[PDB]
Design a protein around this ligand. Sequence first.
Ligand SMILES: Nc1nc(O)c2[nH]nnc2n1
Ligand SMILES: Nc1nc(O)c2[nH]nnc2n1
Ligand SMILES: [Zn+2]
Ligand SMILES: [Zn+2]
Lengths: 189, 189
Amino acid sequence: MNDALHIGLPPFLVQANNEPRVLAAPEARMGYVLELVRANIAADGGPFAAAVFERDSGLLIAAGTNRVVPGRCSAAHAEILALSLAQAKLDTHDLSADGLPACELVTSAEPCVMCFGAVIWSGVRSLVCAARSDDVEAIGFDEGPRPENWMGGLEARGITVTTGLLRDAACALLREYNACNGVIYNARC
Amino acid sequence: MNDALHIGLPPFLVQANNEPRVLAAPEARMGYVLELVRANIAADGGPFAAAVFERDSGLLIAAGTNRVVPGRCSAAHAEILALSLAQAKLDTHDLSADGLPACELVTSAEPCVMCFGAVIWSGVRSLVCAARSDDVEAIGFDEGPRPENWMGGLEARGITVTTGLLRDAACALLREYNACNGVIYNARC
Ligand SMILES: Nc1nc(O)c2[nH]nnc2n1
Ligand SMILES: Nc1nc(O)c2[nH]nnc2n1
Ligand SMILES: [Zn+2]
Ligand SMILES: [Zn+2]
């Protein structure tokens, strides 16, 4: 594009960002995200998906997936898209804006150093991860050089962190992605 | 969009991305980048700008500026837009892809933790900064929790790093923004 940075979304994702969806339980939220991982893999993307939910009600605000290769954009990680699309939807660059319900980013895998920073500047007050960093590195994806004890860095900034949620289900999807090739392989790898 | 990730670019930035331009000297490259910083401030954006140049020829590939507030996107840092717009233009998520010239990211200030990762994933082989992280955090801009010796971290990834280029002018622009960042109206601003 000439007058804008435009990252298009595939059909399943456009739908995911425009379909009403309230998922109370944390496992319900993560389960849905893993559904997005599968759909994204079939849509030429990396094995990564994430979604911003209102922390308490579980109302889905926005979802993103790895679109690095098909989108010719190394910054197009699931977290970046999810956080940015949620901000556009709520009409603010700051999800912690006064009067705004607390937001939570539910992600299929622990964040790379890039998305680590993205979470910090986003305004989200919670981060829930499925697959661990080691799980991701085991299929060729780099997390990059994150600071020492990144989880503590987030908590120290008001962002609670949960890991390992439905990890096994996520790994099955990571192992399947690796087994069946990949393509130019996403970013952070 | 209310579906795709869309960050609009202000006229001056479109202009910059539209007109072929070659800047051989580092000072020339940074000088142009600092011109974008001032233009961006005048266009309701943050005091930051960056541009991707072909390292060995000086050809400008793409430029970006902080459009966080106007863009309703916390991930819209100079570096992110510059790197992404360069990739969209060359039609690839890897700036070091076979066939492409070695790229260089010239930025008005040392990268925050988010952009730190973006640089690594981008494919650029060189990073050139003006203002130091202390100058930026001096006017209240957080760089975030970068890993220890992030500069060495980059060099170990094969990305050469230079900093302090035209630091004085960069710093003056930062202070200029700060002096005018308040609610009480000042005709001189
Ligand atoms: N580490 C890593 N790599 C990718 O390519 C990703 N896409 N989305 N999240 C991602 N995380
Ligand atoms: N630290 C920091 N803060 C911002 O707002 C930026 N925009 N672009 N680069 C930026 N870097
Ligand atoms: Zn990431
Ligand atoms: Zn940044």
